[PDB]
């Protein structure tokens, strides 16, 4: 039980960091838990994804604030903003590379139920997408293509093996439509995917079990909100 005991300790500490809103610690604890070898349970997957989401979420918000100031820079037009924006950016990139590295070394596999395979491939698209948000050079196309390929393989599994109301399928379609809109600059694909997803989920809404109703309906709300915004603009 060398890993069995240590792994369970790491899971226990990830849950403590969660309660304390210590998401950097939570992420590191869940990364250590993954590397012990075992596959994650549903609950453990969620701890991993929430931990790193909150970590990169702070960096992305900071990067957006700074990048915006950088674009309006005029009473002191010095290198201060670019320098600090590059620091945050390098930090964000390092977190995305850590998550992508963990997905590719331990989590993405050809086995497992459809939920787990879609969950990790969506994560792969998401962190490639975060890289794409800040990419500017000749690597931007590669990063976008990597995000798209991950999202596409996940989409293919979800429509083949999971019901239209499944929260993971729904959250994948939401984030892929955001990719279409913001990253690939294809508002028609974004609108069409969000609308088809929302329409097909509505059709099974009446059958949705309790254990999934909350998550599904929250994502359906986001899908509809994005649609209203994207369509009214066009």
């Amino acid at each position: 039980g060398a890993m069995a005991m240590e792994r369970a300790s790491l899971i226990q500490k990830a849950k403590l960091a969660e309660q304390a809103e210590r998401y950097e610690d939570m992420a590191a604890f869940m990364k250590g838990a993954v590397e012990k070898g075992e596959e994650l349970s549903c609950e453990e997957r969620n701890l991993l994804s929430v931990a790193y989401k909150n970590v990169v979420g702070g960096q992305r918000a900071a990067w957006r604030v700074l990048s915006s100031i950088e674009q309006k820079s005029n009473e002191e037009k010095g290198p201060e903003v670019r320098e600090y924006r590059e620091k945050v950016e390098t930090e964000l990139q390092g977190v995305c590379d850590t998550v992508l590295g963990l997905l590719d070394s331990h989590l993405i596999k050809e086995a497992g139920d459809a939920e787990s395979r879609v969950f990790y491939l969506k994560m792969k698209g998401d962190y490639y997408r975060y890289l794409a948000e800040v990419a500017t050079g000749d690597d931007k196309k590669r990063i976008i293509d990597s995000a798209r390929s991950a999202y596409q393989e996940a989409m293919d599994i979800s429509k083949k093996e999971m019901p239209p109301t499944n929260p993971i399928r729904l959250g994948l379609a939401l984030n892929f439509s955001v990719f279409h809109y913001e990253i690939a600059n294809s508002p028609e694909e974004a609108i069409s995917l969000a609308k088809t997803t929302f329409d097909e989920a509505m059709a099974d809404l009446h059958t949705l079990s309790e254990d999934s109703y909350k998550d599904s309906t929250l994502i359906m709300q986001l899908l509809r909100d994005n649609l209203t915004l994207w369509t009214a603009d066009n």
Partner: peptide, 11 residues
């Protein structure tokens, strides 16, 4: 943050 459309992470 300034982004109006949302991804799952906001939840």
């Amino acid at each position: 943050n300034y982004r109006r459309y949302k991804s799952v992470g906001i939840l």
